[PDB]
C-alpha cells in the first residue's frame, strides 16, 4: 500500500502532498519528494521532527520520546512514523510541547 500524506505548515500557511509507501517513514519520503522538514536525532528520541495528526493513523512504535498522553493528543515523530492510512499532519510542531 501507498498512502497519501498531506503536510501542513500553519505558520507559513503551506500544504504539500506526498505519497508514502507503507513501509517507509514519513520524513524519508518527504525528503525524497523535495520537501525538507526539521529533524535532529532522526531516531525517535527527540522532539525536533514533531508533527500533530489532523486525521488518519500512523505507526510510530519505534519512537521513544513521546509519552502516552502526548501520543494520544495526536503528536507524532515524523522521522520514525509509518503511515497506516492516508494522513493529514501539521508539521513543525515541536513548540506545542513546552
Ligand atoms: S529527529 Fe529526533 S525524534 Fe525525530
Experimental technique, in short, is X-ray
**CATH number of the domain that residue 93 is part of:** 3.10.20.30
Task: Give the CA distances from residue 79 to residues 26, 38, 42, 58, in Å, rounded to whole numbers and listed in that order.
Answer: 7, 9, 5, 12
Give the residue from 23, 24, 66 showing the smallest Cα distance to 44.
66
Phi/psi zone of residue 13: left (φ > 0), alpha (ψ -120 to 50 degrees), beta?
Answer: left
Segments in the chain forming alpha helices (H): 26-32, 68-72
Strands 14-21 and 2-9: antiparallel
* Ligand 1 atom at minimal distance to the Cα of residue 39: 1
Cell of 41: 536525532
- Ligand-binding annotation for 49, yes or no, is yes
Tally of domains within the chain: 1
Q: Please indicate whether residue 46, judged by its CB atom, sits closer than 6 Å to ligand 1.
A: yes
- What is the CB neighbour count within 10 angstroms for residue 21? 13
- Ligand-binding annotation for 51, yes or no, is no
72 contacts 52 by C-beta, under 8 angstroms = no
Range of the domain at 8: 1-98
Q: Resolution in angstroms for this experimental structure?
A: 2.5
Strands 87-90 and 2-9: parallel
Residue minimizing CA distance to atom 1 of ligand 1 = 42
Task: Give the CA distances from residue 35 to residues 3, 67, 80, 83, 98, in Å, rounded to whole numbers and listed in that order.
Answer: 16, 28, 16, 17, 26
Give the residue from 32, 28, 22, 33 showing the smallest Cα distance to 78.
28
Amino acid at each position: 500500500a501507498t498512502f497519501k500524506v498531506t503536510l501542513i505548515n500553519e505558520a507559513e500557511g503551506t500544504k504539500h502532498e506526498i505519497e508514502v509507501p507503507d513501509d517507509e517513514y514519513i520524513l524519508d519520503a518527504a525528503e525524497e519528494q523535495g520537501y525538507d522538514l526539521p529533524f535532529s536525532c532522526r531516531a525517535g528520541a527527540c522532539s525536533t521532527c514533531a508533527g500533530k495528526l489532523v486525521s488518519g493513523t500512523v505507526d510510530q512504535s519505534d519512537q521513544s520520546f513521546l509519552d502516552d498522553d502526548q501520543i494520544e493528543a495526536g503528536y507524532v515523530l515524523t522521522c520514525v512514523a509509518y503511515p497506516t492510512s492516508d494522513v493529514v499532519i501539521q508539521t513543525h510542531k515541536e513548540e506545542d510541547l513546552y
